[PDB]
């Protein structure tokens, strides 16, 4: 079929501080692998590059490579500040829960940009940015601080809990799904092969640019 190589760069993602390192790493790794799957499904051989910066490509890689795909992003999950309810234990209301609870919703923010480049010149052949704020993600969470006028309460009646990490997981799942969906839209053998002319031209301009002076 196609003897053409695509250089897949490592995703460069920054996140908000509330997202665990484990979650960040799994996100990065699965992003890279799913993009790999997409490109292989469209008929290209994929070379995984041990970097995310196009300049750290070896000349070998720039040579064998038809195109390079670069991802970068800021993935933020923060509460919608309007929807944080802080209902506290009313002392003696016939039923007194000695736990103070908070209730909120996490919304997405930031961006993920995918860029198709010509390896030799490093010039951008195309790019699409997905705005994460545009996703309608509202993941409810509740955490329970141990309240102030409950010191006498014994261990059993004050078991705090927090489900933030589950909401973070759910939000990252949807984000990942919607993102891979867009990427699958864009990285079609038809879209990628439509760059072949400019890619040849740019390689040429930069391949001859090395051999003059």
Author numbering: 26 to 238
Text from the published report:
H. pylori adhesin A (HpaA) stands out as a pivotal adhesin that plays an indispensable role in the successful establishment of colonization by the pathogen. Originally characterized as a neuraminyllactose-binding hemagglutinin, HpaA is a 26 kDa lipoprotein found on the bacterial surface and flagellar sheath. The gene encoding HpaA is prevalent in most H. pylori strains, and its amino-acid sequence displays a high degree of conservation among H. pylori isolates. For these reasons, HpaA is considered a promising vaccine candidate against H. pylori.
The crystal structure of HpaA26–233 was determined using a C-terminally his-tagged protein construct, excluding the first 25 amino acids from the mature lipoprotein. Initial attempt to crystallize the full-length HpaA2-233 was unsuccessful, leading to the engineering of the HpaA26–233 construct resolved at 2.9 Å resolution. The protein crystallized as two homodimers within the asymmetric unit of the P21 space group, a conformation that likely results from the large crystal lattice and tight packing of the protein within the crystal, with 40% solvent. Further characterization of the molecule using multi-angle light scattering confirmed that HpaA26-233 exists as a homogeneous and monomeric species in solution, with a calculated molecular mass of 22.5 kDa. The crystal structure reveals that HpaA is an elongated protein consisting of two successive antiparallel β-sheets, with an apical extension protruding from a more globular domain composed of one of the β-sheets surrounded by three α-helices (α1-α3-α4) stabilized together by hydrophobic interactions. The overall fold is well conserved among the three homologs, except for the apical domain, which exhibits significant structural and sequence variations. Of particular interest, the apical loop L5 harbors an intriguing feature in the form of a hydrophobic 118-LLF-120 motif that is fully exposed to the aqueous environment. Consistently, all four 118-LLF-120 motifs observed in the asymmetric unit are engaged in similar crystal contacts with adjacent HpaA molecules, burying the leucine and phenylalanine residues within a neighboring cavity formed between the α-helices α1 and α3. According to the cell adhesion assays, the flow cytometric analysis unveils the significant contribution of the 118-LLF-120 apical loop L5 to host-cell recognition, as mutation within this loop resulted in a 55% decrease in binding association with AGS cells. Interactions mediated by this motif were severely impeded by reverse charge mutations (107-EETIQEE-113 mutants) leading to a substantial loss of binding activity with a 50% decrease observed.
